[PDB]
Amino acid sequence: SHMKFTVEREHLLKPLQQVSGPLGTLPILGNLLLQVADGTLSLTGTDLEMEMVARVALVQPHEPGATTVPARKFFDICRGLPEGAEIAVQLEGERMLVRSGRSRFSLSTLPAADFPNLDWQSEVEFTLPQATMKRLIEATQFSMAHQDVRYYLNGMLFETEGEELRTVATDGHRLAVCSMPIGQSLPSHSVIVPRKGVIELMRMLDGGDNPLRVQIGSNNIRAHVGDFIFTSKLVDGRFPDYRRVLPKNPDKHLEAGCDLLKQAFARAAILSNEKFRGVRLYVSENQLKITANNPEQEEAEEILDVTYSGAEMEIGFNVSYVLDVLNALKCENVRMMLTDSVSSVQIEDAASQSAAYVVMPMRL
């Protein structure tokens, strides 16, 4: 192949890092695909489920072509050269020559023709700022299942309704849901993005307001922001309906400071059972008592002054599920809506209905 290019180190590093995301059984999947055409260098990495593409503009002399090169070794070479270095790349046979200053490297390649592609047609499309997509995912991702036999829960539901984009995640014990209006009329549609792709998309986006274009096909999803393109296969399955797990008519309302509540739970967790993580909540007369004990028969008790409406009640929880919610809310005051000891509980920011979390109790 004819591929040749010269580019500054600092233009390669972030693209190499991003397209290396999906990389972690087939040798070519440990390589990045490099392509030069129409004055552009494209870099692609894939795990066969998702792929990441980064495009780099070539202002110096170049020649079109393609190859695939070991990702970690190529990245380490670029990262290790001095700041500002010019990196010249060319092919000699089945080896890629990399040269900068007095440094020279010869890497083994695999033919670009062998590299797997992810062609499909978009059916739903919309644009939103990348920070909005990132925080929608951050707000719910921790409640996704991992390696559950119900494969459709090892991912995140992306749902459009009216003007809103929604993410939903649940593992069968707890659920997280977050909605944001994006100011475009959308069809009613939902797809499941696999958890590995969810996390990689989340890590590709930064807190910027750069517009992100989303294309959803019947079997694929794609997100384009700046010079980066993320694509994933979808999980083909039916997802639970979050509306049907929300508490239906909560007659008990607790409100408290997020940090104070989180810190009381964190200290009680220390003396909980290390495998079952159960803590007990007792709410009455505007006071909450959290207790925990472990096989050693040690005991923690925390008392908090809260604002509580409803009948006195006692309810058990896995404290990690509760702490997951409170670490995610990052807000001043939380609200907990309860019904009884055997029914789910809804937790949210007292100042926002944008995100809601549902946690199912424990019998302890």
């Binding site: 649940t170 014990h173 797990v245 199912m360």
Partner: peptide, 5 residues
């Protein structure tokens, strides 16, 4: 631990 659904 009770199931959510």
């Amino acid at each position: 631990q009770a199931d959510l659904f």
